[PDB]
Amino acid sequence: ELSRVDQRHRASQLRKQKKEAVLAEKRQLGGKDGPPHQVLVVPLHSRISLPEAMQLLQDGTVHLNELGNTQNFMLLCPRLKHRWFFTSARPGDLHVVLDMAKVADTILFLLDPLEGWDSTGDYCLSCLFAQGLPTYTLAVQGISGLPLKKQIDTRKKLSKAVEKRFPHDKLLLLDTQQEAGMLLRQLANQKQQHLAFRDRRAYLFAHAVDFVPSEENNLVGTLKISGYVRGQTLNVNRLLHIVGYGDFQMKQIDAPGDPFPLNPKVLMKADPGRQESLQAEVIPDPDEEAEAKMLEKYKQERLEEMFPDEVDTPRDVAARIRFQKYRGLKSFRTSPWDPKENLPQDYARIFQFQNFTNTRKSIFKEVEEKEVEGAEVGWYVTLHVSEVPVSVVECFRQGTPLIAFSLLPHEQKMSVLNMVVRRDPGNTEPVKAKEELIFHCGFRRFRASPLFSQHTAADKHKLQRFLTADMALVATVYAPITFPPASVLLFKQKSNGMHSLIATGHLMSVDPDRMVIKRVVLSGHPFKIFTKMAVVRYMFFNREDVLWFKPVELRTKWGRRGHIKEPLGTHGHMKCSFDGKLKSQDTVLMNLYKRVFPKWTYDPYVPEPVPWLKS
RNA sequence: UACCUGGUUGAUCCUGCCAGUAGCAUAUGCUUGUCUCAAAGAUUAAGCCAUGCAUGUCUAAGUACGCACGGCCGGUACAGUGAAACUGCGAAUGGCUCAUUAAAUCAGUUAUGGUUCCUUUGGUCGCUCGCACUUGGAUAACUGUGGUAAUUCU
RNA sequence: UGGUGACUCUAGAUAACCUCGGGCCGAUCGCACGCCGGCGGCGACGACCCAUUCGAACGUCUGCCCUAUCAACUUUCGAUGGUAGUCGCCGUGCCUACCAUGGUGACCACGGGUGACGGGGAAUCAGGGUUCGAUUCCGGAGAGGGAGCCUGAGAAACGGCUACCACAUCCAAGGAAGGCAGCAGGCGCGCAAAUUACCCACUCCCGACCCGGGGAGGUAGUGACGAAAAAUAACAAUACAGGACUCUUUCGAGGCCCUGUAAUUGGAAUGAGUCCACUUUAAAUCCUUUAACGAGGAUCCAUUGGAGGGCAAGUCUGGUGCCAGCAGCCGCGGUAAUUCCAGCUCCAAUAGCGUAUAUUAAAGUUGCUGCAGUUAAAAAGCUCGUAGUUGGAUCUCUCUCGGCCGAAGCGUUUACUUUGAAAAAAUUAGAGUGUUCAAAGCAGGCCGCCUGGAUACCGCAGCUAGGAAUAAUGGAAUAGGACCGCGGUUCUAUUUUGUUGGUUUUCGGAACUGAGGCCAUGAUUAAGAGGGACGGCCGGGGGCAUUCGUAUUGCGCCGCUAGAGGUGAAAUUCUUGGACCGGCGCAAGACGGACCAGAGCGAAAGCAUUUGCCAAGAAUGUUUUCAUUAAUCAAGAACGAAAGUCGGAGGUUCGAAGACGAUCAGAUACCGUCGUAGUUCCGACCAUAAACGAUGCCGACCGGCGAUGCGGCGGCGUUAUUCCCAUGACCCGCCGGGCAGCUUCCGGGAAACCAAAGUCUUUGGGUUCCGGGGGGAGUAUGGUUGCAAAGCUGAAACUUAAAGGAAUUGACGGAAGGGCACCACCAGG
RNA sequence: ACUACCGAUUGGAUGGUUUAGUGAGGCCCUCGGAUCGGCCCCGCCGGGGUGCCCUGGCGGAGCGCUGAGAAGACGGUCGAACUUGACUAUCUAGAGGAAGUAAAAGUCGGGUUUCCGUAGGUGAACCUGCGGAAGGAUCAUUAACGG
């Protein structure tokens, strides 16, 4: 490039460009045009009382909103030219923390001085890492509640206790109002993490919610979700999803006056009939017994880890009947399988994409590179919803918040979701393949019966009958369609409504063509050995059983590969050819493959979790 | 401690590089009980900066009429301490960074017989043949009236 | 007057000047107060100037990294110099005016780049060196970019001002205000870096100042950057296991034997911790010192990498099965996995240890010490030639002024060596001294004293004084050369012509000159260096003209002609007009065989018919001449096979291209028939080759042999029909310079091989070019030459663990021979 | 569907040498005189020496004279910067062209020793034309020549 001025001027140009990008990013929050900065406060340890820090932090002009249980307020300061919205959460109550930490702009964690944090807070923090961190900001409370002598070593011990979970952060303390000024200054200017799962749709937080019942006996009426738009330009025709209560149609948007402007009734849109998105999720045209079962599950998992899929052939039931729908494959990787060969009535009830990647690109470019005529971000708007149950307002009076987000096109239909997911080491309870588990798949909450498979690059995926503690699996189930990326969480009712976390991951591409193959290997003990010829017993029990499964190729735990020549006895006595000679301590085994499909167990309603505790 | 080892071939002897070996410096991973030293926004961006601080100053010895004070003794010009303000000096030292800059900077060497110099130190300070037992006019400090949304504005 | 090495210095005299935007010659304060109405001691501030100190500012000599795909730069608008000025604190093209046309450069100017602030210095390192230095000390530069100022002794100052640019804060929209490359903090950038703490107590600085201020600085906080010390256990008895010793044939048994291992037993001793008190300190913290509690290993529990080779420590067990993976490299995985993943065991370092990148030593793989160039990567195609580098032998202290000495010249000038004085501290090497040891530190030690706080290095360049080998350079050869006296011309003597005005005092010194004497008067020698002469020759050395041969081709004539041409076979083609053929000729261009050699000449490319001319050329011979004139060469220049390219001529043969015919599962290579440019000559381009001895040029030493060419020398004998004298041709030697061969344990070398490819770790005669694993690639780009084709110079991105060189065997011959056997054959049974 | 070249849009933007022009602000010079003060002149007056010499105060005009002096301006100078073309140098959106890659078992299917330099065959390999090399495997003979 030469000519030192030329290199310098090119560098100055690039500097200008990246500074313009950064400045264009940072005005989107906490300002005259920006929406308020939502800060969610979690006291991790049980010794901390959030009211103490909450009143140290509340002083600036305050506006104390109130709810049934939680207490969140609005803060406005022209000194820092900053609008804050502080909302408090309790650890263990994973409902509230999970469904309102996915819209909060910055999370402030409180830590006791003596210990790191509570085990319940440890569970909460594990779940929050697994679903996505907006911005964490470490804080402590009891540092100045001790003399200096133990104070410095207390900070040292906390710094020791944090580096195992948070890799490196400074611990910013809260004891005085001036320290709260330092913290507020810190939270005003942070390297904001763009959690793209928030940004790609039009998500809105509700400050007011009013129910106008059309008919009180029908227990359904018009809802007034008024608050701030925080994602994209929100459009009426796109449907609206409430995080705990499903996706449904919204009828009207108005824009009233904002409650808290930084420097101190008209309707925006009604939904046209033809341009509306239609609510069509499917195609229109068509005590000690539990302990004993748990021990049986333990024995089954122990049997299905040292032996992969060894199934003993029953001598009562005929073998070609019990494995009627199975087929044999020469090689798992290379042998073709038709994805449209055998389909039930369930895949005649979902929606398929001709090309997912093209559709995802088109939808994302239509969101980003195009502008719609809806209300812009930062606006204090009100949404009138035609169809909603009453009880959500009751929940709005309980203490849980309401968050409503406008969906992408084709996000309400049913499809076959595939979730890349690995087991959390905190839980060790054996989970079978077709169990009913709760998915938190990115603002959605539902029980499902998934199917676990390997996460390889090939076409066929062998079904996993149990969840492995290190291998990363793919959970496949009928589910409402969601566009990746998406944080995915797996929970189970342990006892008394305690949601236990098992596994977490991301959402992979959604398609029904990803077939899952269930395998069964049948064992046989070779009791006669010639050179490259063997006579094997106890694999079948009839005579026509060997004749039915003639073309299937036998393999061997010691690596030999063969194919059967003839049946000899009336019982299961079987002549087999081989590449080489078997050892005397050897077993032959034959692979049988079938296509397996997930169960249709989907329901959007979820029970409210109780506060989590350790056994 | 003036050192070498594996790798071309059927095998050998070579040229020859690749790789290993030791250092030293930055980053980073994993782990970390004592104790004494101790580097630390140089590299990328000599990019941008919210807020606080970083440069002030009085002796017996320039100017005291702020009762601001305890306080003389009373017509005692000025008893004392002394805010403020004028005056004098400093603020050009220090700190910071390495962008510029290739006989430039810089280093040793010489020169000012080609110059400037606060301060400090020693000299010089009735050499001059031409109201002074004390000269003049202001201006702050203070009193009082104000302007401007606003300033260490006036 | 006084002084420097040198003044246009300092001092003195005279004539004057001395700015109204002006120069000094106390209209000042404090402290005690006191003596014959007047005189006074001490201190503070001040002041024109001088000197000083702290500096600043310009100059001087020497010393920077990479680049030629940067070779000419500078000068209209100062570039180099001269004179006068302007401005400046001064010296100057610093600026102006007038002149002159200069100044720098292959000793690399000018232009670029730099991931450049320079140095002290850091890391490594035998010796040499290589790399780094933003960074606490010194010097410099800048406060977002440029610019211009105020005030002041000192600023082109930014914690001062004024503008424009770029950002950017408060508005009441009229305006106002900026500058963290200061300390903390944020954003941003990133692989990458700490507290919006406390204090002026230490160190020092500032002020009016025994008092005030100090994000300078100190002190704590974060801190596995790096560095020093150093715990995680010690002893005894048992209980086993081994090893030796003794007694026992052995098995076995003992020891006042050894060595291990024990969630075995016993006691004692401790620190990490929790905590008091003191000390520390500005107040603290820490370290140090005390009470109190505080330890049985089944924890107050050590990690990080590894166990195929390099490279220490397992062919241990289970799982996965050329999958997953491991592995820097070589490689492993395809089922007994020595390499993956676990367990156990073990190794390495150890409060540390992995990885990535940069750089260093290894790398004698950047070579000055100290590499290589026949075949592995490499010597230019060849010669000339400038700068550069290098270069034969030779030669052994004094005359005046002052007290035997000091002053003055030295001696042609340097390089070299040695000494001396100057060369910042820290860092480094290093002396001393129990920081408890140590890294450190500069302290400390003894009954108020006694001491330390050294030293060495500090390259080059510049001063200094000796040395005179070695290496340069000079002193007399048209003799206007030295040393002495004998004279002239001119300018001058600073005192002796008491005081003088003087034409003259004398004396002596300087520049040009005429003879004389004097010097042992003055020229080292002739390289087994070179040049140049001269003699006889010698050669396919070159050019011009001339001449000859033979073949081929064409034409004319005669004769016989029906086939001829070609091939492994064939076929295309010519011919009955008349081929091929045999002969007589003519013409056209070509080429100079056999002679022809391990010969010859030429710088190489290359050069072969006779004769003449032209100018060369080596070697030999010389008791010739010049006397160092030489070797190799960046730049630059002639020649340069074939092919090619421009203009002409001529075209016999042959022939790129192009046209036929054969040959087939697939032939398009293959073979034979024609045929254009070309091959030839003349004049210009082109400048490349396997341009090859795959071996730069010059010089020295180092084995043998017996042939050849040229020249010379010495010769028994043989031939010119015995030769009448010399003279050519054979034979035996010797010398010099060549062309080559044989052989050697000269020595080299990886070897093949080589009398050089030797005299090379026992490494240095001079010099030129050039190579750095293999590809990309002699490619792209740029410059330059060329009509063009092309040539010369010439990368990188990316890519691989080999590519390569010499020699030794033979699995195998689809290579050939033998030889064997009534389990093979002949004759047969 | 994913890369990465070329490129229609002078695509736009910014900087360094610049040609020409314009030129903020400071400084210097020439001016200028908002004002402030003084020297006079009157009118009211008090004193001394004998209405006259000078005094203290007030107010007035006399463009009477004098000292200081602000704004502003011509001119010089340094000079940031602004506009216009050229040389550039760089950053940043793009219709399209030519490519390639993963996905379709979809349709049709004998010769040569090895080179080097040039020129032609069609760019290269290969072949041929001309000139060169070995880095490519030497068996047999060779005294007389006089009459």
From Swiss-Prot:
Keyword Nucleus listed: yes
Family under the similarity heading: Belongs to the TRAFAC class translation factor GTPase superfamily. Bms1-like GTPase family. TSR1 subfamily.
Keywords: Nucleus, Ribosome biogenesis
The keyword Protease belongs to this UniProt entry's keyword annotation: no
InterPro entries: AARP2CN, Bms1/Tsr1, BMS1_TSR1_C, G_Bms1/Tsr1_dom
Protein name listed in UniProt: Pre-rRNA-processing protein TSR1 homolog
Pfam families, A to Z: AARP2CN, RIBIOP_C, Tsr1_G-like
Known role: Required during maturation of the 40S ribosomal subunit in the nucleolus.
Organism annotation: Homo sapiens (Human)
GO cellular component, one term: cytosol
GO biological process: endonucleolytic cleavage of tricistronic rRNA transcript (SSU-rRNA, 5.8S rRNA, LSU-rRNA); maturation of SSU-rRNA from tricistronic rRNA transcript (SSU-rRNA, 5.8S rRNA, LSU-rRNA)
Residues covered by the Bms1-type G domain: 35-193
PROSITE patterns xrefs: G_BMS1 (PS51714)
Lineage summary: Eukaryota, Metazoa, Chordata, Craniata, Vertebrata
Extent of Basic and acidic residues compositional bias: 1-9
Organism domain of life: Eukaryota
MF term (GO), any: RNA binding
Localization per Swiss-Prot or TrEMBL: Nucleus, Nucleolus
